[PDB]
Amino acid sequence: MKDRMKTVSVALVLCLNVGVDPPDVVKTTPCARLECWIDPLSMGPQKAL
Amino acid sequence: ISKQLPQLTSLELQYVSPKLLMCRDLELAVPGTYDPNQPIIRIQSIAPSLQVITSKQRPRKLTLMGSNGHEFVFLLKGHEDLRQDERV
Ligand SMILES: [Mg+2]
């Protein structure tokens, strides 16, 4: 394996804005929006991010 | 702490009171009512989470389900002497 190119760094681009529903989508009551198994829409946007 | 209290919200019983979250049909009556001349509604269950109201003080809006299925809503809060209110 002469090619030894490894990965060095990672970028986490979390473009989602909590509490903002884009016009593209219409949700329903069972829209569980878990991300990373953690759904604090209760806690407010800053704790969520 | 002052920068987390504004973010405070509805709280789940699992993280503050597992015992109450597991509470089920007791021998107790519904707190706000007792009529010796009529049947007594027994506490059937309580809601999984409470709602925190925002002001200078933060009461908590409790829901409670009785044996008949009726729901009763209360404001839980500290820093108070309610005995005067009972007399009034
Ligand atoms: Mg109170």
UniProtKB/Swiss-Prot annotation, chain A:
Belongs to the WD repeat RAPTOR family. It comes from Homo sapiens. O-GlcNAcylated by OGT upon glucose sufficiency, promoting interaction with small GTPases Rag (RagA/RRAGA, RagB/RRAGB, RagC/RRAGC and/or RagD/RRAGD) and subsequent recruitment of mTORC1 to lysosomal membranes, leading to activation of the mTORC1 complex. It comes from the Eukaryota. Component of the mechanistic target of rapamycin complex 1 (mTORC1), an evolutionarily conserved central nutrient sensor that stimulates anabolic reactions and macromolecule biosynthesis to promote cellular biomass generation and growth. In response to nutrients, growth factors or amino acids, mTORC1 is recruited to the lysosome membrane and promotes protein, lipid and nucleotide synthesis by phosphorylating several substrates, such as ribosomal protein S6 kinase (RPS6KB1 and RPS6KB2) and EIF4EBP1 (4E-BP1). This is Regulatory-associated protein of mTOR. Highly expressed in skeletal muscle, and in a lesser extent in brain, lung, small intestine, kidney and placenta. Part of the mechanistic target of rapamycin complex 1 (mTORC1) which contains MTOR, MLST8 and RPTOR. mTORC1 associates with AKT1S1/PRAS40, which inhibits its activity. mTORC1 associates with DEPTOR, which regulates its activity. mTORC1 binds to and is inhibited by FKBP12-rapamycin. Forms a complex with MTOR under both leucine-rich and -poor conditions. Interacts with (via TOS motifs) EIF4EBP1 and RPS6KB1; interaction is independent of its association with MTOR. (Microbial infection) Interacts with vaccinia virus protein F17; this interaction dysregulates mTOR. The chain holds residues 51 to 99 of 1335 of the full protein. The lineage of its organism: Eukaryota, Metazoa, Chordata, Craniata, Vertebrata. It is found in: Lysosome membrane; Cytoplasm; Cytoplasmic granule.
From Swiss-Prot, chain B:
The modification Phosphoserine is found at S49. Changing T63A: Increased mTOR kinase activity. Changing R83C: In FCORD2; somatic mutation. The modification Phosphothreonine is found at T54, T63. Changing T54E: Stronger phosphorylation of RPS6KB1. Part of the mechanistic target of rapamycin complex 1 (mTORC1) which contains MTOR, MLST8 and RPTOR. The mTORC1 complex is a 1 Md obligate dimer of two stoichiometric heterotetramers with overall dimensions of 290 A x 210 A x 135 A. It has a rhomboid shape and a central cavity, the dimeric interfaces are formed by interlocking interactions between the two MTOR and the two RPTOR subunits. Serine/threonine protein kinase which is a central regulator of cellular metabolism, growth and survival in response to hormones, growth factors, nutrients, energy and stress signals. MTOR directly or indirectly regulates the phosphorylation of at least 800 proteins. Functions as part of 2 structurally and functionally distinct signaling complexes mTORC1 and mTORC2 (mTOR complex 1 and 2). It is linked to Smith-Kingsmore syndrome: An autosomal dominant syndrome characterized by intellectual disability, macrocephaly, seizures, umbilical hernia, and facial dysmorphic features. The kinase domain (PI3K/PI4K) is intrinsically active but has a highly restricted catalytic center. The FAT domain forms three discontinuous subdomains of alpha-helical TPR repeats plus a single subdomain of HEAT repeats. The four domains pack sequentially to form a C-shaped a-solenoid that clamps onto the kinase domain. This is Serine/threonine-protein kinase mTOR.
